[PDB]
C-alpha cells in the first residue's frame, strides 16, 4: 500500500527487472502486478535508449560492479539535478540498470552470479533516498505508477 516506497519493495522491483533482462525469471508466486507493468514499459524505454545512445554507450566499459555503481550514481545525479521527478524519469532508472547489467554480463572482469543483486541494491538505494517521498505523495507504485502505465 503506502509502504511500497520502502527499501524492500523497491529492491524487489529492481531485482525483478534485472532477472527479466537476464532471462532468469524466478520460480514461486511470480512477480507482482506492479512489477509486471514496470517490466514492459521499462524494457520499451531500454531498447529506445540503447538505440539513441548506442555510440556513447559503446564507449563505456562496465568492467566491475564498482564501476557500474559509480557510473549509475554519476548519471542519476545529472539526470535529476534539475529537481524534477516524474514517473517517466523513474522508469528510465530501471531501463538504465538493465543497460548496465547487459554490459556487465559481457565485460565484467571477474564475473559473479550475485552481481545483479548488488546492482539492484544500489538502484533501490537511489530510488528510495532521492525519489521515495515523491513516490509516496503520488500514490506509491500501486496507486500511482500502475495507474499511469497499466493497460486501459
Amino acid at each position: 500500500g503506502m509502504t511500497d516506497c520502502e527499501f524492500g519493495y523497491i529492491y524487489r522491483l529492481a531485482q525483478d527487472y534485472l532477472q527479466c533482462v537476464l532471462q532468469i525469471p524466478q520460480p514461486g508466486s511470480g512477480p507482482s502486478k506492479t512489477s509486471r507493468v514496470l517490466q514492459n514499459v521499462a524494457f520499451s524505454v531500454q531498447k529506445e535508449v540503447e538505440k539513441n545512445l548506442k555510440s556513447c554507450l559503446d564507449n563505456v566499459n562496465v568492467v566491475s560492479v564498482d564501476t557500474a555503481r559509480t557510473l549509475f550514481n554519476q548519471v542519476m545525479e545529472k539526470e535529476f539535478e534539475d529537481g524534477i521527478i516524474n514517473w517517466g524519469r523513474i522508469v528510465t532508472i530501471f531501463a538504465f540498470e538493465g543497460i548496465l547489467i547487459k554490459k556487465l554480463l559481457r565485460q565484467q572482469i571477474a564475473p559473479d552470479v550475485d552481481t545483479y543483486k548488488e546492482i539492484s541494491y544500489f538502484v533501490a538505494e537511489f530510488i528510495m533516498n532521492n525519489t521515495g517521498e515523491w513516490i509516496r505523495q503520488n500514490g506509491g507504485w500501486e496507486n500511482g505508477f500502475v495507474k499511469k502505465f497499466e493497460p486501459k
Binding site: 545512445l53 556513447c56 563505456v60 548519471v75 545529472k78 534539475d82 524519469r89 528510465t92
Partner: peptide, 21 residues
C-alpha cells in the same frame, strides 16, 4: 562528457514518456 550525454538522453526519454505514457 559521457555521463552528461547519457543523463540528458535518459532525462529526455523520461520526460517524453511522462507526457505521453
Amino acid at each position: 562528457q559521457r555521463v552528461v550525454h547519457i543523463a540528458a538522453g535518459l532525462r529526455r526519454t523520461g520526460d517524453q514518456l511522462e507526457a505521453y505514457g
